[PDB]
Design a protein around this ligand. Structure first.
Ligand SMILES: *[C@@H]1O[C@H](CO)[C@@H](O)[C@H](O)[C@H]1NC(C)=O
Lengths: 324, 165, 324, 165, 324, 165
């Protein structure tokens, strides 16, 4: 016969298949996966920043300083929060945190955090500090929230106390105060002497006046009265003044915050770890250069986009058609 | 579709090393398989650019659209979840369709590449070869191992052979 | 001449045209429509589940049990609600439903619904039931909201009444109560004897205290006083206690709800029908396998996506080029 | 574009039954129209797969993004409507563009298919026929009704006829 | 040699390049830009409608009629608002505007606007008008907000005043009123005689009762008391009644509004101009037929979509491959 | 890709006036450059339709998704910004990808157009010319200035010249 030369293409031993718009399950020589399906299954640090586990405490009890909770005094920052949905500790004394939804959102993740003493606990005047069997500390001693001071009568007299805070930090500052509503007018007399006491809280943009709402609540622990805890973000250069003659949980510790609301409160019951990823889900940490993921719609950080899809194979090679 | 792959060249070559497109020859002195580094590398560069473009251009923020809510703000909680879900549905459809669309184009690109290679060889040989219509060319003259290379590297001259035909 | 064979393609008698990216109005042999344009023009059942028409009553009057409204006692479920925007019946007694926007949203569609008696209407103590000419029933007799009981003085005495509810249903339960604000301190004396009466409502997470806000309102029907109706979702295992000594519209009937907020409150004046579709719009029901629709942006259920577009024709056949 | 449909084959055939692509012959004994079930069915399968993919992949939730609001919560009501409208605008543009894009590709696919069929017949006949450049082939030898079928089914052998040419 | 004819294509002198999916920086003969990058750098009229600059006043002070602010009496419409973030004038008397966020949103842009006198300032009864050194006018004379009238005791007597408004305009009407909280019960006696005064505001859908919250606020200017300003949108055919015996900032001027919330409150410190565009950003006006823009995410009107991208070049010509 | 532009026709022609595709001739009486108004205008119409479609179909509302908020409603303010950002991210990716996709198709369209023009001329001449495989055709007979025009306007008849070949 004669000399001959032929043009051809690659064939391999592959079961690799892709779908095209015009055809299903087309054999190809090579392909890649677009969707990330692998994760750590743990809580990791997010881009170099460790989260904060709330232990046995709810966010509410943690943020007001429940003595049974681990203190947040040493915290500098957090990428996200880890909370047990059935946490035993919260507001140890029967009460509610006002507007806690917003606060949760703002404290989901903060890049700059530091507790600070707004007003000296003894600079208020002639009042005593109240502790309770409802808020015992790590020891067993009667105590109270770290961030608040329960002012009561001293020497059978409750004077009109008034202190103010000046935001000089240059950043936003979270302030907490509270109102105690006794079981009866008899108890507010026993605790604060003054009949029908009030608390007036004001900035230069708003002013709130609180009065007592006496009654018996179906409480927990030992008590049957009710506390309402409020909060406000004080902006740089702003000032907030507190004046009261009873039933007043005074501010002591506040928080200096910058770059906040950048996180998430995960309630997932997975384990914390030494790993570090750029994307954290409620199911595990993700570390991939892929831009899609079908693992968990609940994700935070520099993540691949979550999509509702099975694996997607991008063809790189050619149609794998077998040898003549 | 360009009719080459799984077309008139009805099968692929296992044992084609380090290439997608190539040549198979047979002269008096052997055989005879080699990839065409030129068209293969150019194709590799294109697929790489395509894959990188698809991935690198997604440089936005794609984590969840959600916030923290208490049990008394259910409506705003539901709207946030619905919006996050809707954004997710847009990306889901686009991801699936893009892969289907691009797989279509990738396969046809390969088909076009070997067809262009076949046409390139046919133009070289001109009347010095018979087109068998299966990707093969029957030479009308004898072809050195050197002669085969001049065909493979594009430098084959039909004038320096036209007479033995 | 010689024998010959030719290669060709299909041509037809079509005025069918499609647009391509490169060309407008290209003749093709066949094409399909992507957008659904046909609907029933009626209110249909949604995926096997019938809606609920509110008749001549607004949602507010329906949810508290306006005697002139048809009772919701027999309802088990609903896919969506149908409401007349100019409905004559609502809160028959001059008043407002607090946070009605949220409630409307949560009751737009519920998969599991059942009314239930939270607290026995006679288990409260020594009080009488108040009826009014403002809330007459189907007969013409003086009555009041079905879900609430208007407690008044009995034998010139209004005792401190206190009952509590325990959510044992395993599902979320909607509870309604109310505060009546008389025209003057004279009327609260006539109705409740006690000067400056109160109502205290509490769970283990929150507590509200209500006092009376006496004054003359520009009311309707006969009355000139004012009622405020509040509500709360009690979660499985939670309890809510009511204590009052006057001006208190006590809870009687609540609602056990599961899988809610899944609906819509349509106000469109179209007719209800025996048909059943997988997508309901404010203009009609849609039943199609197409994934797009340009009929109505207001749509609920397993719908095609609404898009702002005229009909879109997908080419299936080839370019219809006429015979040589 | 592949230059066949409305190109060198300048017109279509009415009375082409049960097919998109086909053959028209004429020997001493008649005429002579038949669809090519092979390339037609393969094309039908592709269009069907394309249409199904476009529709089946939209498996998300596409009803309105809205909630219930009273007359005192206008802002949140307006944001919900604006977001629903924005999501709608994304789907609107993608729907229109996809149809334009795919109609382009569908028409060109058909063009490619008949061009590949034409090339397929040309490769069969080789030197046994003259390519008239209009989709027709003039046979240099006589062709049975049986002979025409061997051309239509791909099994035509140019060696068993090359000499009458 | 022989006669010959050749087929070829265009080549040019271009450095013009585009990117394709398969290749970067491909030379082409011609291309167009998809993204608009040019703007006026000024505040322009938006589609024929001029905005409104708030001068030295915040929106709050402008909407209640701070005497130091330019009056909005002659305004007919506005496409958007221009506000200085550090505006010296606002609520001249120490106070807060309730729910100002919503109001800001609703007044960001209004197509039909006109101030109107709800109730005659002298038709209220036997009361005097109060002016203050905190709210001086353009002259230096003591005054007060234009939209409100500060009613005080006349001849040592503050009678129960009661007037009502009827929305007959056919459009939505914004109404403003206010409550003044004196520094002490002594001041409310000096100003209003009556001990524990009240204000009752009601429509046929809602009713609010206001009492005074006495106390000393850390105020500004001269004063140390506190004002709270409230508002409500009265719908066509609705009526709002005001009754009070002290501490009441009565409504005088309201606003008739149609097609509102269509704007934006820009705080950018750029200059206002005579130009007119169809798209206004916080950085300048945009006038282009292009559908994309990478200038500013903050944009209002008939705009190109903002995208996070460098310039995008659409190829029109062919690959520019140089001459043989 | 169709193998013409930067393919077998390895370079472009500067000094091709008022056209994208054209002809270059040489007979005994000169040279010899002219655009093909037919295929050029048709190509211009397509690019124009494409560009207009891309722009005209964006007829929705694309200004910011945002509202006015005070400093006490941070959460709803953040969700609004996140949603606006997310919608922006969808348009950003689609814009970039569409341009990459269409630039690919525009370039290949031009490649296809000149390839179809080349094939169109080859079909005219038939055996009356030698295909040099570089876009040029060597005529076997003499060609008037009139003859060149009949080739350019498609009306060249190979029968009225076949014999000088
Ligand atoms: C802190 O507040 C006081 C109270 O007026 C003020 O004088 C002082 O200027 C504020 N601090 C700073 C940093 O200005």
């Amino acid at each position: 016969i004669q000399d001959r030369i032929c043009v051809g293409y690659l064939s391999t031993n592959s079961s690799e298949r892709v779908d095209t718009l015009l055809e299903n399950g087309v054999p190809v020589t090579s392909s890649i996966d677009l969707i990330e399906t692998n994760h750590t299954g743990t809580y990791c640090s997010l881009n170099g920043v460790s989260p904060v586990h709330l232990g046995d405490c709810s966010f509410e009890g943690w943020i007001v300083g429940n003595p049974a909770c681990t203190s947040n005094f040493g915290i500098r920052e957090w990428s996200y929060l880890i909370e047990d949905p059935a946490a035993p500790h919260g507001l140890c004394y029967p009460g509610e945190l006002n507007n806690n939804g917003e606060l949760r959102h703002l404290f989901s993740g903060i890049r700059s955090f530091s507790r600070t003493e707004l007003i000296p606990p003894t600079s208020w005047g002639e009042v005593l500090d109240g502790t309770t069997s409802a808020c015992r500390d790590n020891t067993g001693t009667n105590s109270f929230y770290r961030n608040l001071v329960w002012f009561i009568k001293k020497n059978n007299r409750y004077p009109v106390i008034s202190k103010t805070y000046n935001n000089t930090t240059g950043r936003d500052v979270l302030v907490l105060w509270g109102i105690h509503h006794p079981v009866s007018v008899d108890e507010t007399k026993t605790l604060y002497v003054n009949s029908d006491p009030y608390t007036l809280v004001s900035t230069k943009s708003w002013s709130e006046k609180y009065k007592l709402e006496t009654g018996v609540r179906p409480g927990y622990n030992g008590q049957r009265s009710w506390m309402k805890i409020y909060w406000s973000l004080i902006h740089p250069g702003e000032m907030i003044t507190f004046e009261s003659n009873g039933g007043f949980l005074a501010p002591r510790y506040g928080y200096i915050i910058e770059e906040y609301g950048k996180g998430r409160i995960f309630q997932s019951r997975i384990r914390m770890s030494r790993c570090n990823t750029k994307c954290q889900t409620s199911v595990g940490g993700i570390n991939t250069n892929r831009t899609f993921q079908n693992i968990d719609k609940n994700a935070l950080g520099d993540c691949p986009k979550y999509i509702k899809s099975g694996q997607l194979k991008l063809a790189t090679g050619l149609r794998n058609v077998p040898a003549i | 579709l360009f009719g080459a792959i799984a077309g008139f060249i009805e099968g692929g070559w296992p044992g084609l090393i380090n290439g997608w497109y190539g040549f198979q020859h047979q002269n008096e002195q052997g055989t005879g398989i080699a990839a065409d580094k030129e068209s293969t590398q150019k194709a590799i560069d294109q697929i790489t650019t395509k894959i990188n473009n698809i991935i690198d251009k997604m440089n936005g923020n794609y984590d969840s659209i959600r916030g923290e809510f208490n049990q008394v703000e259910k409506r705003i909680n539901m709207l946030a979840d619905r919006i996050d879900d809707a954004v997710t549905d847009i990306w889901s459809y686009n991801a699936k369709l893009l892969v289907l669309l691009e797989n279509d184009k990738t396969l046809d690109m390969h088909d076009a590449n070997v067809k262009n290679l076949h046409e390139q060889v046919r133009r070289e040989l001109k009347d010095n070869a018979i087109d068998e219509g299966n990707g093969c060319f029957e030479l009308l003259h004898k072809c050195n191992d050197s002669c085969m290379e001049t065909i493979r590297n594009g430098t084959y001259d039909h004038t320096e052979y036209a007479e033995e035909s």
